[PDB]
């Protein structure tokens, strides 16, 4: 089946200053395809994981904030833009997932904190975490 494909670049400034504890969430602004499909999406990150078993990781999800019909099927890909402006450390759905309004899908163990937070690895230029999300909605 064909798709409508779109993207959002989320810059989280002053990332080293995040005070989020395990289970606390930051949501992005809402975004859409611009195809007037009435779908609104956002990203959400847990800097210290969804739960105790994931507290060593950032957990990253795509949330369907509002939709007109009962269900949407969509593939998704998340990557980090490094200091050289290139995509790295990407994770992508192996198939389309079924979203309804208020449902998310993503990666509970998206990136290990001990790796991300070491500035020498080039993922927090200017103390900014920049995430790039591509969404493909199945038509």
């Amino acid at each position: 089946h064909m798709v409508v494909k779109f993207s959002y670049m989320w810059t989280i400034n002053n990332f080293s200053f995040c005070r989020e504890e395990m289970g606390e969430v930051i949501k992005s602004s809402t975004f859409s395809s611009g195809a007037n499909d009435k779908l609104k999406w956002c990203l959400r990150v847990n800097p210290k994981g969804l739960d105790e078993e994931s507290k060593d990781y950032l957990s990253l999800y795509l949330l369907l904030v509002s939709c007109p019909k009962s269900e949407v099927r969509a593939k998704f890909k998340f990557s980090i833009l490094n200091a050289k402006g290139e995509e790295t450390k990407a994770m992508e759905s192996q198939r389309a997932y079924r979203f309804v309004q208020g449902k998310d899908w993503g990666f509970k163990k998206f990136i290990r904190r001990g790796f991300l937070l070491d500035e020498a690895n080039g993922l927090l230029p200017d103390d900014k975490l920049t995430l790039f999300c591509e969404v493909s909605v199945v038509q």
């Binding site: 959400r44 969804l50 957990s59 999800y61 998704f76 994770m91 759905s93 192996q94 997932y97 449902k103 998310d104 899908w105 993503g106 990666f107 509970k108 163990k109 998206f110």
Partner: peptide
């Protein structure tokens, strides 16, 4: 390889 999941 990681698999996708939902927070709910």
């Amino acid at each position: 390889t990681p698999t996708a999941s939902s927070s709910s």
